[PDB]
Amino acid sequence: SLMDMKRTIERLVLNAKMSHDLENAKFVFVAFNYFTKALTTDVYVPAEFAACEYSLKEGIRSIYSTMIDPGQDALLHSSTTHDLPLPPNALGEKNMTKLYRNIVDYLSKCQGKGKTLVVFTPAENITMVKSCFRYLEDDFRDGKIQVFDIQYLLFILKKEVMNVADLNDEKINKFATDAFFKKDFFEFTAGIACQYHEDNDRTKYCTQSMVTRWAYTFTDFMCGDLAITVQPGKHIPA
Ligand SMILES: [Zn+2]
């Protein structure tokens, strides 16, 4: 449930704080683009994926990024956002089974094997991201990746950072942290999109750019409370 997700995020962050390793807690951010959504069913057809692993101390530690060719409204959503070419001329990995395995391999290298995997994405994108993972599938069907709210993470993380920094502020609430996240202050950073999206100037809607911007947003919102040396590329734009 969403209530459950929220309590779980709070517990994750508090585990880190209590171990005195909040700055080293690692979080994986994910972003999907989709070509279109089935009219009657919860089926989003994936077009692009990125993931990154982030900690306050190290900033971006790794990034995984790929265009997706699923083979096949589609025109409108796609043309106004990512504008990736539609099937049968779509770019990217066309082996969906291989893609999913490669994504899980990446998440497992980050989080460990034999564990439920946890990733974060904007609240308004959770349904879509789960649907895209399902499209890519399964032993997973019969039975894996929990998709949590990155904005709730930002909120809880900011409050616990401020507690640690002896900076508690009753006036900082989730309206404020949501506002900061949605400002997208690093939208116009050069060189963080994939090559296609640099070519077609739709970097705003590039998954690789998006997970990088979210990382820079976390750093800008919190690393100042913590006396962490920010690193070019990793914490802030190169
Ligand atoms: Zn892209």
Curated annotation (Swiss-Prot):
UniProt KW keywords: Cytoplasm, Developmental protein, Differentiation, DNA-binding, Meiosis, Nucleus, Oogenesis, Repressor, RNA-mediated gene silencing, Transcription, Transcription regulation
Compartments reported by the entry: Cytoplasm; Nucleus; Cytoplasm, Perinuclear region; Cytoplasm, Cytoplasmic ribonucleoprotein granule
GO biological process per UniProt: cytoskeleton organization; dorsal appendage formation; dorsal/ventral axis specification; germ-line stem cell population maintenance; intracellular mRNA localization; male meiotic nuclear division; microtubule organizing center organization; miRNA metabolic process
Substitution effect: residue 48 to A: Reduces nuclear aCCumulation in ovary and ovarian somatic cells. Affects transposable element silencing. Causes female sterility
GO cellular component labels: cytoplasm; nucleus; P granule; perinuclear region of cytoplasm
Keyword match Repressor: yes
Name the UniProt record assigns to this protein: Protein maelstrom
Origin organism lineage: Eukaryota, Metazoa, Ecdysozoa, Arthropoda, Hexapoda
Residues of the full protein shown: 84 to 332 of 459
